[PDB]
């Protein structure tokens, strides 16, 4: 109880300042306390950094979390924390299982039917069960409605282990942080060969933040997943990716039949979240028991998933 009282008493909001306008002698000591509060909450000392931890409840927002109920064979325990997960829409109304995908188990949903592929098939060796999770991949990519049945649910922050019927928790909206109050930062892990920086392909104003966009795109061999990092807005990166998708407008020209509406859409772009632009993405390497793939490490993520907008 003494430990609990000493822990609650430090983690308490400071009381609001009163100015008794009515009385005379109380107003003087209250504005005395007011200037003694400002003078120790502004100057260079340890008092002004002591004041920042009280948080005075607009600036800080506890995020929302998504409790998802998944199968253990459709997931892997050995993955990193900050993997952006992609929930699949289920046709049955009372289902109970929300089939999510890490980018590697979704990369084996990409390639099985046609670096990243090595660690992908090292993490998810048998793809028949993962092709049995989705009821239709080839027809749904044939009519190109796969982008709306796949919704992103933000990066994983807590994975409680279970041998059957695993349960994961992702931040769907808000500042990406862990769930356990022994506090740590959830660094968003993105594999590098799917990650491209848009200034690199662009080859002048400083923003506030540099956002991260996923773009499920419909290449003619199969689907493709590419994580786009842009300092610009959403309706600006639609135009910028219209510039980037140069041979797609030639392919949609060279499939000249217009009544076949399948090749008239080329993927869709969804905004995942906002990390800071003054601190860029860090490169890192993620190791399995045998292999190591280079992985983009992204810190200070604020997840806010947007709709898929058609290129």
């Amino acid at each position: 109880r003494r430990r609990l009282q000493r822990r609650i008493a430090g983690l308490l909001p400071p009381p609001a300042r009163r100015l008794n306008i009515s009385r005379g002698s109380e107003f003087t000591r209250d504005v005395r306390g007011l200037v003694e509060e400002h003078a120790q909450a502004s100057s260079l000392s340890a008092a002004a950094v002591w004041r920042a931890g009280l948080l005075a409840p607009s600036g800080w927002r506890p995020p929302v979390f998504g409790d998802f109920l998944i199968h253990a064979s459709s997931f892997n325990n050995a993955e990193a924390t900050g993997t952006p997960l992609f929930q699949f829409k289920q046709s049955d109304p009372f289902s109970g299982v929300d089939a999510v995908f890490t980018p590697l188990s979704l990369f084996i949903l990409m390639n099985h039917g046609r670096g990243l592929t090595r660690m992908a098939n090292l993490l998810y060796d048998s793809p028949a069960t993962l092709a049995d999770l989705v009821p239709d991949f080839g027809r749904l990519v044939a009519d190109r409605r796969f982008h709306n049945f796949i919704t992103p649910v933000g990066p994983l922050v807590e994975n409680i282990k279970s041998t059957y019927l695993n349960k994961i928790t992702t931040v769907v909206h808000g500042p990406v942080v862990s769930k356990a109050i022994p506090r740590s930062t959830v660094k968003v892990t993105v594999p590098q060969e799917a990650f491209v920086d848009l200034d690199a392909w662009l080859s002048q104003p400083c923003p506030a933040d540099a956002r991260l966009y996923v773009a499920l795109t419909y290449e003619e061999a199969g689907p493709r997943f590419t994580f786009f990092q842009s300092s610009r807005g959403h309706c600006q990166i639609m135009n910028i990716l219209r510039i980037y998708y140069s041979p797609s407008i030639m392919h949609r020209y060279a499939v000249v039949q217009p009544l076949h509406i399948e090749e008239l859409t080329f993927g869709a772009v969804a905004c995942l979240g906002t990390f800071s632009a003054t601190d860029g993405w860090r490169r890192s390497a993620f190791n399995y028991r045998g292999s190591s793939l280079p992985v983009v490490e992204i810190d200070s993520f604020y997840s806010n998933v947007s709709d898929w907008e058609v290129i």
């Binding site: 409790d67 289920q90 049955d92």
Partner: protein
Amino acid sequence: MDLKVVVSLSSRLYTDEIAKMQQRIGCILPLAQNVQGLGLGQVYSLETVPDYVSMYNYLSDCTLAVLDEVSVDSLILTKIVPGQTYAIKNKYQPFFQWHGTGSLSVMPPVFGREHATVKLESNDVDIVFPMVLPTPIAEEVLQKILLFNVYSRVVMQAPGNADMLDVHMHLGSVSYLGHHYELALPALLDNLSLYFCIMVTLLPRASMRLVRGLNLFQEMVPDEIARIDLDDLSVADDLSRMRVMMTYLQSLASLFNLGPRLATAAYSQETLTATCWLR
């Protein structure tokens, strides 16, 4: 912050009015404080013609509010901010399941005025709440009421080309995530339909002016029935046609942006609510 907004009810509410306001307590509604223009009820009044586009522009202009508590004289409600979230519920009599959909659209209720309303006999106003529904259902009901308005006005003018049962078989039901709903298809929705009609009529000459602005690359992709219009038209008529067409195109594009698009995270089907923020 302090966000509790109260509205000024003139007359005290009776028991059935309390029950009907309690029945839909979790839903959202716009805002203009006056109880007269409290929501969408001044467009859905008997005073004006129920025009869709002015209703949409009023719904996208003014702010929204989710109400928390109801009383005999007060209506506790919090308006919407872009900062934080509110827990909202699906309490609409056309029931659409919010199973796992990350987006919610706020549109005027096209399923009839009586379906989403509360009629206050004692007061001065009859309030309505807009439709909060998942966005593939939203664009699907926009398709199946727009094309039904077109295919209905066509068979009112000439019933020799199409069939009413043929359009009522498909254009009266939406099917999203295995749920099969029926559409109450009965005036309404005529100005939006004729706006779309004017757009797709003047879009041939619009595309011709655009491809003549900057050659056979963009002239191959029209088909032969889609290419031929003669090169004789007055300057003022062409300019006014292009200006009015592009005005209706911009309004129609921002209108098929479905307004205030809400986003949800955790839909709990046991309690029928989801954590909802403004996006």
